[PDB]
DNA sequence: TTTAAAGATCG
DNA sequence: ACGATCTTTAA
């Protein structure tokens, strides 16, 4: 299991075996919430159309992939033992929200990334990244992960907009799978998870399959009732499992 | 300016 | 999911 280079939420790590399992064979991978992309890094599709909200992760995801040399010798300084300290994440963390150059922005998040509180990405309502400092002992440069995801790369297009313009991307041969932001246990809102299921219901109208995974709960279970769902036993967290649903045509 | 409740901030 | 301290919202 290939790993990404990013600390990120809904790395599905030990998901990535049965997601496997019940993906259907295509041409292409659409990917509308691809985040750190570890489906994208396990799996073998000829080509790969991956989308997120975050202009960030898009842009930085972009300057990887056409500057790939070129961004990792820049990145590799900022992971040395004296930027692992409070005062000088902080002006790093200043010098990326007032940055206007991409490719320094790109380098930056790498290093806010791995040296931020828990891997966290958060912003305030100016668009501001505010992580504070995260104290650990020695961050990992993701060298080997860079390079890869760089290759792998090269059958894949970007592109920053939410979730219904990216599903509208896809045609016959092409395959989408969906890990939107999970369902409340008790922002992405209640009407943006139903609607995803609503679209999922309209591709498969139209001979394209749709793989989705959220958890298991009484709302997942009704959302997704037009697909043959299964089930995955993590259990923890009450105890909650992991629900796959396939529009298989 | 008053005001009580809600939302936003960021370590 | 935390919390002291900001800003916001409406009459
Ligand atoms: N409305 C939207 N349209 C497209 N992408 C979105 C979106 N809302 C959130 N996303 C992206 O989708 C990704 C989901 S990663 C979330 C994984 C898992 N469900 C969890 O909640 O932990 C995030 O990186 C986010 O940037």
Known sequence: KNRAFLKWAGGKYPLLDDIKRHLPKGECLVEPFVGAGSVFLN??????????????????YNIVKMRTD??????????????????????????????QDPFRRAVLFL?????GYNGLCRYNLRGEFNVPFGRY????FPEAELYHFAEKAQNAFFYCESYADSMARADDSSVVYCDPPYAPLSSFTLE????????????????????????????TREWYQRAKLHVVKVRRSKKVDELLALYKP
């Open 111 to 115: 290093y806010l990334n791995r040296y």
């Open 192 to 219: 943006q998870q139903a609607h995803l299921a609503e679209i999922a219901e309209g591709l498969v109208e139209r001979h394209i399959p749709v793989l989705i995974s959220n958890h298991d709960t009484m709302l």
């Open 43 to 60: 799996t073998d599709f000829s080509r790969y159309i991956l989308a997120d909200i975050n202009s960030d992760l898009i842009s930085l």
């Open 137 to 140: 002992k020695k961050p990992y």
């Open 70 to 99: 070129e961004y990792v010798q820049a990145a590799r300084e900022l992971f040395v033992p004296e930027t692992n300290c409070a005062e000088v994440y902080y002006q790093f963390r200043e010098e990326f929200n007032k940055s």
